[PDB]
Amino acid sequence: AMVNKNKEGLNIDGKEVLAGSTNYYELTWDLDQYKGDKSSKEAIQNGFYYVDDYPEEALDVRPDLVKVADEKGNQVSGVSVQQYDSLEAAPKKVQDLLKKANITVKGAFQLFSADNPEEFYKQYVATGTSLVITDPMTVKSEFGKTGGKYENKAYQIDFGNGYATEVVVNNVPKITPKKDVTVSLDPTSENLDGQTVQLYQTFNYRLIGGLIPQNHSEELEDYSFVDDYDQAGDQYTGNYKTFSSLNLTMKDGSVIKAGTDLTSQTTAETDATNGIVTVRFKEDFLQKISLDSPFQAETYLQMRRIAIGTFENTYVNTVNKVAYASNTVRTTT
C-alpha cells in the first residue's frame, strides 16, 4: 500500500497539487508474510528493504521529514534512507539488490534499509510489527508554470524479491495569470493591450488570476494580485474591484456565482513611493472555499494615464505565496 496525503492527513490520491505543495506519501511496510514458515536465517540473509521510485522531474524529496514508524506512531530507529540520482550512480550492491528483486527504476530513487537485519527481525518482523514510511516530497515551485502529471511508485523487497505497491498519480495545474487593459468592468469589454490610452484618461488594468482547478489538495492560504506598475506613466487611483471568474462552491454547500463582486473579501496595500499595489484575498474567505471547487478571481485596478509615451505593465498572482507572472501589456499615449 502507498497513499498520498496532504499536511492535515487527507488522502489526496489523484488530486490536483499546486506547485509548492507537499505530497506526504505514506508507504505501508507489511511484515505480515513472515507469519509464514520461512526461517529467520532466510529473512536476515536477504535483508529488509523498501524502494521508492519518486518522480524527480516534478518533486523534491524533503529528507528532513522522512520518518519510519509503526502503526501506533512509535518511531522506528535503524532504518536508513539513501537517495540516488540514478541506477548507474548507485553502488554495485544496490544495483544487484534491485536486479535480484526484479525491479527497474526511472532515474532517481530512494532505498530504505534495515541497518541491522538481525535486530530488525527480532524487534519488528518477529513481533508482527508492520511499519509506515512517511516520505514527503514537494512539487517544485517552477513546475506550476508548465504543469503536468507525476506518478510515485514503491516496492517492498522481502526474501530478495521486490513487490510493487500501488502507484499514486497526481496532476500539477498550469497556473497562467493574464493581464488585459479595459475602460469598463464588463468582462466582455475590449482589450486595449496594443492600443492607445489618451493622456489624463482613467482606465483599468484587468488582472485575471490563475485557475485553481476543482479537486485540489491543500487549503488556499494566499491568492494575491501584485502589480508594480510603471509610475512614469501610470498612477493608481486607490480604487479597485475584484470579481469571481467562475462559480465557487463553498464548504457548506452554498455557491457564489461567476461575476460576483468579492471586493469586500479582499484587502489592498499600496506603495506610493514605488508604484505598487497588492490586492489580497482575506484568509478567512479563502478557507470557506471547498477543496472540490475551482477557484479563480480577477481584479480591476483603476488607473490614470498621467504622461505621454509607451508604458508596459505586468502583474504577479501569488498562490499560496508562490509567484506566477502574467503576460506584459503595452499601451501608447
What residues form the annotated binding site?
30, 32-33, 53-54, 56, 106, 108, 228-229, 231, 274-275
Q: How far is CA 242 from CA 113, 172, 187, 259, in A?
A: 53, 26, 12, 9
Residue 71 three-state SS:
coil
d(Cα 44, Cα 156) in Å, to the nearest integer?
A: 15
Instruction: Considering the complex, state which of residue 33 and residue 102 has its C-beta at the smaller distance from Ca ion.
Output: 102
Instruction: Considering the complex, state which of residue 260 and residue 270 has its C-beta at the smaller distance from Ca ion.
Output: 270
Total of residues contacting Ca ion (CB under 5 A)? 8
Specify binding-site residues for Ca(2+). 30, 32-33, 53-54, 56, 106, 108, 228-229, 231, 274-275
Taking the complex as a whole, the smallest distance from the CB of residue 45 to Ca ion amounts, in Å, to 28
Signed CA dihedral, 328, 301, 222, 226: sign only: positive
Question: Is 31 one of the binding residues for Ca ion (CB under 5 A)?
Answer: no
Q: Contacts with Ca ion in 267-286 (CB under 5 A)?
A: 275
Taking the complex as a whole, the smallest distance from the CB of residue 167 to Ca ion amounts, in Å, to 12
Taking the complex as a whole, the smallest distance from the CB of residue 15 to Ca ion amounts, in Å, to 20
Taking the complex as a whole, the smallest distance from the CB of residue 237 to Ca ion amounts, in Å, to 15
- Helix (H) / strand (E) element for 92: namely helix 92-100
Instruction: Considering the complex, state which of residue 106 and residue 140 has its C-beta at the smaller distance from Ca ion.
Output: 106
Per CB under 5 A, the segment of 159-167, 226-234, 249-257, 296-304 that binds Ca ion is 226-234
Per CB under 5 A, the segment of 23-31, 55-63, 81-89, 190-198 that binds Ca ion is 55-63
Task: Look at residues 186, 210, 244 and name the one whose alpha carbon lies nearest to residue 316.
Answer: 210
Give strand pairing partners of 244: 297
Contact letters for Ca ion, residues 74-113 (x by CB under 5 A): --------------------------------xxx-----
Running DSSP on this structure, what letter comes out for residue 215?
Answer: S
Among 16, 53, 193, 234, binds Ca ion (CB under 5 A): 53
Per CB under 5 A, the segment of 180-188, 213-221, 224-232, 264-272 that binds Ca ion is 224-232
Among 228, 235, 241, 306, binds Ca ion (CB under 5 A): 228
Contact letters for Ca ion, residues 293-332 (x by CB under 5 A): ----------------------------------------
d(Cα 304, Cα 296) in Å, to the nearest integer?
A: 26
Instruction: Considering the complex, state which of residue 60 and residue 228 has its C-beta at the smaller distance from Ca ion.
Output: 228
d(Cα 272, Cα 274) in Å, to the nearest integer?
A: 6
Instruction: Considering the complex, state which of residue 109 and residue 121 has its C-beta at the smaller distance from Ca ion.
Output: 109
Q: Scan for cell 541506477, then name that residue.
A: 87
Neighbours of 156 (CB within 10 A): 23
Q: How far is CA 329 from CA 48, 264, 290, in A?
A: 59, 27, 33
Q: What is the DSSP string of 168-195?
A: EEEEEPP---EEEEESSS-TTSPP-TTS
Neighbours of 116 (CB within 10 A): 15
Radius of gyration of the chain (CA): 26
Instruction: Considering the complex, state which of residue 249 and residue 331 has its C-beta at the smaller distance from Ca ion.
Output: 331
Instruction: Considering the complex, state which of residue 81 and residue 211 has its C-beta at the smaller distance from Ca ion.
Output: 81
Instruction: Work out the burial of residue 194: count CB atoms within 10 Å of its CB; fewer than 13 is exposed, 13-18 middle, 19 or more buried.
Output: exposed
Return the C-alpha cell found at 182.
Answer: 479595459
Site residues for Ca ion per CB under 5 A: 53, 56, 106-108, 228, 231, 275
